[PDB]
Structure formats: C-alpha cells, structure tokens
Design a protein around this ligand. Structure first.
Ligand code: K
Ligand code: K
Ligand code: K
Ligand code: NA
Ligand code: NA
Ligand code: NA
Lengths: 90, 94, 90, 94
C-alpha cells in the first residue's frame, strides 16, 4: 500500500532529522536524540529533558508543527495494518 | 461489535506486555509498570520516569508507535459503543 | 446548545471528582489537584507530580479512560463556539 | 480558505498571549515562555516546568481548554490545505 509506504518513509526521514539535530546541537547520544524526537512528535513528552539552547527550542517548536500531523497519520495507518489480521480472523 | 472486542483484547494484551517489560527490564514495581504503560500510550506521559536502559528506550519507541493506535482505537470504540449510549440513556426523563 | 451544555456539565463534574480525589488521597492543595486533573485528562501531563499511593495510581488509570473522550469532545465543541464569531465576521 | 486564515491568526494571537503571560507572571525568558506555550497547547508538555503561581495555574487551565482546540484546528487545516497538497505535488514524476 503506497499511502502506508510513503507515510513510513516520511516518518523515518523526519525522525532521522531530529536524531541528527538533537545529537549534534543538544549533545544527546543518538538513541536519546531519537527517543526525544519520538516522544515529542507523538506528544507523549519527556519528563527528564528539554532543549537547553535557544536554537534547540526554536527547532523543537517548528519540528512539532512540521511533524505531528504526519506522525499521527502514520500511527493510524500502522494501526489498521497491525489490527486487521486479528479482526479478519475473529 | 467484533472490532470493539478485538481492540479490547489487544489493548489488554498490550498493557500486560508493558507491565511485564518495565517491571523486568527497568525494575519497576508491577503497579508502576502498568501506570507507566497507560500514561505513555494515552500520551499523557509520566513527569518523572523515563526508561534508563537502551533496551527500554528502543522498546518504548516501538511500543508507542504500535500501542497508541490500539489504545486510541479502543478509547474511540468505548466512547461510541458504551459511553455515548449510556449517557443518552441516562438523559431520558422517566 | 444542549450538546455543548451537557458536555460542559459532564466535564465540570469530572474535574470536581478529580479535585476531591487528589486533594484528599494525594494531599494536594485544591488548585494543584484541579491542575493535575486538567493536565492529565487533556494529555498535557505534568512534569513535577505523579501519584504516590497505589490507590492514586489505580484511580488515575481509570480516570484517564473514563474522562479523556469526554474532555476532548468538550474541547472540540468549545472550539466551535469560540471560533465561530471570528469566522462569521471574516 | 477563510477558516484557515482565521485559525492561523487566532493561533498566533494565542501564542503571543502565552508568551506575554508566562514571561510576566512566571518570570520566564520570552523564548522559554513561547516554548512552554507551544508544548502545552500541542499537549506534548514540558518535562521540567510547571506554573508556580496560583495565577499561572488558573491561567494555564483556561489556556489549555481554549488553546488546544484552536491549535489543533490550525494543525488540521495546515495538513489539509498546505502539507498534503505539497506532498502530493512533490510525488509527481516529472
Ligand atoms: K520532570
Ligand atoms: K499528549
Ligand atoms: K504529554
Ligand atoms: Na508530558
Ligand atoms: Na506526572
Ligand atoms: Na521535556
């Protein structure tokens, strides 16, 4: 399904960008930079980190508006695909 | 509603899995592991705890992407099939 | 509009219940108990408090499932009413 | 799209109001006040700061109820009117 495939690609690319940004500008380990990107765009949030640089705060504001809609579109399409085999078996 | 029953069971299994994961790998008490799993997948977040192990961080990323869709599908079906009909019935003057 | 009025009442009643619970079981000032109830059900979250009692953790789990749908229905209906005068003037 | 333009302006005014409020009453630097306003109204939350004054707590409660609806209305219109058409156009082989 192309719509799912394109949403996956867009999501991956968006998360790579955040991982690169937070590891190079905010000094996080790559796994922590990816984690922060994920919990930010899914709106879970993180209780133990917020960006410390003005550049990082501005980036994070724009990153949320650029990425939140795409990530929730991906989460929805992923849910359809993961749940369908159980629905159809049932 | 077969879809509701599926989302209910999958949500329960998802929360059981998180309870087992966070109590085993991150050392949380089971009630705290269940709490963390619920507030993470409903996107509330916990304001104090973050996974400390790299295993926990990777698991949580995958758990979020799969679990948010299931839990909010369940919450939507719960609203449509249970809560809204119950509110409507309870507003009828008798 | 009755649908808005009923959603308002349900939301108020739900927030009062949380305020009573967190102030009596978790020892919060009423304003902090109301604040915690609001940021929990809107999924904002709070970075500086989590329930400390097992009773409070169980309550919070059930409170989220009981209240999240109602609160977002109210937020949506509120948004229609607050935005409409500007839309119609424009 | 007149509705999009209205939601855009109202979102900007809402974020300006929060920036002014949190920098004045809660003592935050303006950039930190804007950051807090954005992560609160998108429901991400900030994992470190909570309003410390009772004024700030009451304001934040009201700001949340009014501002989440505006900001997510804007995000939805931004997705439908700007982001989706741009993605589609950028997928056309030329
Ligand atoms: K915190
Ligand atoms: K959230
Ligand atoms: K959150
Ligand atoms: Na949070
Ligand atoms: Na918390
Ligand atoms: Na944070």
């Amino acid at each position: 399904d192309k719509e799912f495939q394109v949403l996956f690609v867009l999501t991956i690319l968006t998360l790579i960008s955040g991982t690169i940004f937070y590891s190079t500008v905010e000094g996080l380990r790559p796994i922590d930079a990816l984690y922060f990107s994920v919990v930010t765009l899914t709106t879970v949030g993180d209780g133990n980190f917020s960006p410390q640089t003005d550049f990082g705060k501005i980036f994070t504001i724009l990153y949320i508006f650029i990425g939140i809609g795409l990530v929730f579109g991906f989460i929805h399409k992923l849910a359809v695909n993961v749940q369908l085999p159980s629905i159809l078996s049932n």
